[PDB]
C-alpha cells in the first residue's frame, strides 16, 4: 500500500512516432464512396507519442486527461487489465475503474482508495482499492473468453482504444487485428457508450503480475499513450463502408 516496491522509480519519457494509425468512425452514419469532412478530436498525423515498456521496472506516470487519450498496445498474453480514471485520486470524489478478468469486463464508478502503482496477481484488491462505499452505479458487459496464458511466435494481439469525454459521455472505440515500430492502417469501431458524466482530469494504468510482496515478477510488454487535437480529416469510404485512406486537412 504505502510501501514503494522495486518497480516504482523515476524514469525518463522516451518517445516514438506514428503515421497511419488513430482513425476512427466519428459517427454511425453510413456513407458510400464519398469523401466526408468532419471536425472532432483526432490523433494528428506526424506527432510524438510517448513510448512505454516493461521488461525490474514498469512505466506508470500520472498523465493528465485533458490532451485526450489514444491507446495502442502490442502484446501476447494481454498484460494490461484496465485503467484508473479519476480527478483527485482519492475517496473524496468519484472514480472509474475497468477490470478485465477475461470473462466479463466489470465497469464501476465508485469511491476508491488509490496507491501509486497498484498491482494485480487472479486479482488483488486492494492494492487497487482497500474499501469502498456510496455508489449506486453498476454495469455488466457481455461475456466472452480470452487466453491470459503466454504464447510464442509473432505478436498476436493489437488493442487500439480511443478514450474521450464530450458533454459527459464516455465512449470506447475498439479495434482488434493481428499484426517497437508498428505499421498498417485500420479503422476503429465503437463498443461501449456510458453516460457517466464525471470530471476526469488525470489517468493511470494497471499491471498484472506472475510468480513461478516483491516476489511477484512482471512480464514483457509494450504500449504507448497518445494525445488528441481538434483537427479535420478526409475519410475515404469504399463500397463496404470502411476507411481505406485518411487525409489530414492541415499538416
Amino acid at each position: 500500500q504505502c510501501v514503494n516496491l522495486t518497480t516504482r522509480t523515476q524514469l525518463p519519457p522516451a518517445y516514438t512516432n506514428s503515421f497511419t494509425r488513430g482513425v476512427y468512425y466519428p459517427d454511425k452514419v453510413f456513407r458510400s464512396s464519398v469523401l466526408h469532412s468532419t471536425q472532432d478530436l483526432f490523433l494528428p498525423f506526424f506527432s510524438n507519442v510517448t513510448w512505454f515498456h516493461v521488461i525490474k521496472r514498469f512505466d506508470n506516470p500520472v498523465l493528465p486527461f485533458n490532451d485526450g487519450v489514444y491507446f495502442a498496445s502490442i502484446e501476447k498474453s494481454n498484460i494490461i487489465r484496465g485503467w484508473i480514471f479519476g480527478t483527485t485520486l482519492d475517496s473524496k470524489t468519484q472514480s472509474l475503474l475497468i477490470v478485465n478478468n477475461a470473462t466479463n469486463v466489470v465497469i464501476k464508478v465508485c469511491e476508491f482508495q488509490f496507491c501509486n502503482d497498484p498491482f494485480l496477481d487472479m486479482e488483488s484488491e486492494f492494492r487497487v482499492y482497500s474499501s469502498a462505499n456510496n455508489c449506486t452505479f453498476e454495469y455488466v458487459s457481455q461475456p466472452f473468453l480470452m487466453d491470459l496464458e503466454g504464447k510464442q511466435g509473432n505478436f498476436k494481439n493489437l488493442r487500439e482504444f480511443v478514450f474521450k469525454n464530450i458533454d459527459g459521455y464516455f465512449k470506447i472505440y475498439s479495434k482488434h487485428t493481428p499484426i517497437d515500430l508498428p505499421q498498417g492502417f485500420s479503422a476503429l469501431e465503437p463498443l461501449v457508450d456510458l453516460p457517466i458524466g464525471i470530471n476526469i482530469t488525470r489517468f493511470q494504468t494497471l499491471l498484472a503480475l506472475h510468480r513461478s510482496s516483491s516476489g511477484w515478477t512482471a512480464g514483457a510488454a509494450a504500449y504507448y499513450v497518445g494525445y488528441l487535437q481538434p483537427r479535420t480529416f478526409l475519410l475515404k469510404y469504399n463500397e463496404n463502408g470502411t476507411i481505406t485512406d485518411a487525409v489530414d486537412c492541415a499538416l
Binding site: K28, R31, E239, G241
Partner: peptide, 20 residues
C-alpha cells in the same frame, strides 16, 4: 445487400438525406 454495422441505427446519402 450492403454490409452494415450491427450497432447502426441509420445512414445517410450524398446530401443530408436518408437511405437506410
Amino acid at each position: 445487400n450492403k454490409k452494415f454495422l450491427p450497432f447502426q441505427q441509420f445512414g445517410r446519402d450524398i446530401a443530408d438525406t436518408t437511405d437506410a
